[PDB]
Structure formats: structure tokens, C-alpha cells
Ligand binder design. Structure first.
Ligand code: HEM
Ligand SMILES: [Ca+2]
Ligand SMILES: [Ca+2]
Length: 306
């Protein structure tokens, strides 16, 4: 069983080292806390939270970094390297990359204003990476609600509360124009915008993301508080101001009978949201871990030990 006290004897200052690393990086990259949370999500959804995403290419397997959901998108890898080196310096050969990334995600959420909790620990590191599985398992922003639900179920998260709460990760961070062009200009081959996008916000987004513009330009997921971890994400949805199709689907899908009341409850209460977010995060962090003597304590997060 994973346990929050796992390093209390062997590396008691691990969360502190992780915190200071993020605090320091945030001075020059305000986006890093968002990026790190996303890294952990992408770890967990592919063979579980086993740091498989941190591995670079080898001649026998391809890196997940070249997945459709990771390439030219996922970021923060050198920051993870830095906190890893610092922990190895304090606590040699003790803390797994999988656990380190889990703590990093939690600390990132707290540093951005979100809930504070101790994550379960004891995960171990994969002996390979899973590119095809990453391409199969990471959901895409054009997914319908039933597709999103299938994608969460596929990895062991059956509950609509899992989906709606973890979606609150879009309370901060950035999204490239490429992922919303259809909503803005040609939704579902209509040549018209997505009708569930508020028309005032549509104009703003078209201004940031013109047809024939730079597809890599970044826009904030949360128009209310772009860098603060809070429940404002859900208030946006109630106003038809979710950024990506999958955001707005939680509130507007014909299949949203079960998700609408979760969105509303989380918009109405910070405490309700934060409680559900911590619960869902810990469920996601419990996806198929290696434990005990399985896998490794990887010394360099990019390569399996030899
Ligand atoms: C449920 C369907 C999901 C879809 C379709 C989706 C899609 C996306 C997309 C397209 C981006 C922008 C990527 C880029 O522009 O490079 C992104 C960013 C982000 N996602 Fe999600 N996501 C989902 C779930 C989640 C979950 C469950 C979390 C966290 C628990 C998460 C956290 C993040 C964060 C924090 C960012 C901002 C990253 C940054 O600014 O570097 N996402 N997501
Ligand atoms: Ca993984
Ligand atoms: Ca926010």
C-alpha cells in the first residue's frame, strides 16, 4: 500500500527540497507549477505513475516525449532533473522519480494557491517507456464527454467526480491556439464556431488565435485567474467560457447529466472543489504503481539504471 510516511525516516526533507526547487523556478517561469502537475497526469495515465514519461529514447524503446500529447507540449523536464539531483545529494538512492514527480505535482498545486496535503508514497520507477500506450491513453481536446469518460475508465478512474475534479487542473496553465482553432472557425465541419462557446469570449479568442495565425501561440486556460489554483475554472464553464472543447463538454454535453451538478458544486464552494481535487489526485496517483522490490529507484530520471 502506498503511504504518506514512506520517506519519514529515509529522506524526511524530500518535500522541502521539492518545494524550494519549484519556488526558485517560479521566479523566472510562472508557468512551471502548471507544467509539473501536467507531467504527473501524463505519467499516471500511461502504465501508472512510474516515471515512464521521464525516460529519453533508447535503441530498444521510444520515448513517450514523442507522443502526440507530449511532443512540443509537455515541459519542465530539466526542473525535475534539478530537484532529482538535489534529493540524490541529500538522500542518495532513496527517492524514486515516480514519487518525486508526485510530490512535485502536489507542491506545485499548493504553491499556486491550492490545497495542501501529503501524498501517498512508495512508488518505484519503470524499466521502459510506453510511446504507443501514451498515444492510445492520453485524451485529446476534441474528445466528447463519452470519450473523456472512456479515457478515464480505461486507466481505472471510473467516477465522474474523478473527471470533473481533475479537470480543475485547467484552473491554471497555457494552451496552444492549435487546439481550439476548430471551435473558433470550423467546428465539426460546419465552417461555424462551436455554439457552446460564449460569443463574447469567441471574439477574444479569435483575436488571440486568428485563422492562419501562429498555431503555437499560447492562451490561458482560465480567463479569470490564469495562474492561481482555485475554483474559477468551474465558474467559467457555467458561462460557456471553458477554453477547450473537452472543458466545455463537462457542462454542455448531452451526456452531462452526471457532470453538471459536480461543475456547479465545485463552482459554488472552494472547499468542496479542493476536497474532491485531493481525493481525485490521490486516486490518480494510485494508478498501477510498481512497489516493494518491483522496478527501480532510478538515479537519473532520464535513463534506467545500469
Ligand atoms: C480530461 C481531458 C484532458 C484533455 C483533453 C487535456 C488537454 C490539454 C491541452 C490540449 C493542453 C494544452 C497543451 C499545449 O498547449 O501544449 C493542456 C494543458 C494543461 N493540462 Fe490538460 N487535459 C486533460 C486533463 C487534464 C488533467 C486531468 C490535468 C491535471 C490533473 C491537466 C492539467 C493540465 C495543465 C496544468 C495544463 C497547463 C500546462 C502548461 O501550461 O504547461 N489536464 N491540457
Ligand atoms: Ca507512466
Ligand atoms: Ca485559476
Amino acid at each position: 500500500q502506498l503511504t504518506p510516511t514512506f520517506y519519514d525516516n529515509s529522506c524526511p526533507n524530500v518535500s522541502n527540497i521539492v518545494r524550494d526547487t519549484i519556488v526558485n523556478e517560479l521566479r523566472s517561469d510562472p508557468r512551471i507549477a502548471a507544467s509539473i502537475l501536467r507531467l504527473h497526469f501524463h505519467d499516471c495515465f500511461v502504465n501508472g505513475c512510474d516515471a515512464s514519461i521521464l525516460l529519453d529514447n533508447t535503441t530498444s524503446f521510444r520515448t513517450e516525449k514523442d507522443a502526440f500529447g507530449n511532443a512540443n507540449s509537455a515541459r519542465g523536464f530539466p526542473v525535475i532533473d534539478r530537484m532529482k539531483a538535489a534529493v540524490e545529494s541529500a538522500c542518495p538512492r532513496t527517492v524514486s522519480c515516480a514519487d518525486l514527480l508526485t510530490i512535485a505535482a502536489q507542491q506545485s498545486v499548493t504553491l499556486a494557491g491550492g490545497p495542501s496535503w501529503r501524498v501517498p508514497l512508495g512508488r518505484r520507477d519503470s524499466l521502459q517507456a510506453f510511446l504507443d500506450l501514451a498515444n492510445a491513453n492520453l485524451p485529446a481536446p476534441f474528445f466528447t464527454l463519452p470519450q473523456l469518460k472512456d479515457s478515464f475508465r480505461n486507466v481505472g478512474l471510473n467516477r465522474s467526480s474523478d473527471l470533473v475534479a481533475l479537470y480543475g487542473g485547467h484552473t491554471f496553465g497555457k494552451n496552444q491556439c492549435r487546439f481550439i482553432m476548430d471551435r473558433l472557425y470550423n467546428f465539426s465541419n460546419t465552417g461555424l464556431p462551436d455554439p457552446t462557446l460564449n460569443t463574447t469570449y469567441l471574439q477574444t479568442l479569435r483575436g488571440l488565435c486568428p485563422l492562419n495565425g501562429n498555431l503555437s501561440a499560447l492562451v490561458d486556460f482560465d480567463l479569470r485567474t490564469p495562474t492561481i489554483f482555485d475554483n474559477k475554472y468551474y465558474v467559467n464553464l457555467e458561462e460557456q467560457k471553458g477554453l477547450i472543447q473537452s472543458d466545455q463538454e463537462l457542462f454542455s454535453s448531452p451526456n452531462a447529466t452526471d457532470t453538471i451538478p459536480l461543475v456547479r458544486s465545485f463552482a459554488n464552494s472552494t472547499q468542496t472543489f479542493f476536497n474532491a481535487f485531493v481525493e481525485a489526485m490521490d486516486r490518480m496517483g494510485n494508478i498501477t504503481p510498481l512497489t516493494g522490490t518491483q522496478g527501480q529507484i532510478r538515479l537519473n530520471c532520464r535513463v534506467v539504471n545500469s
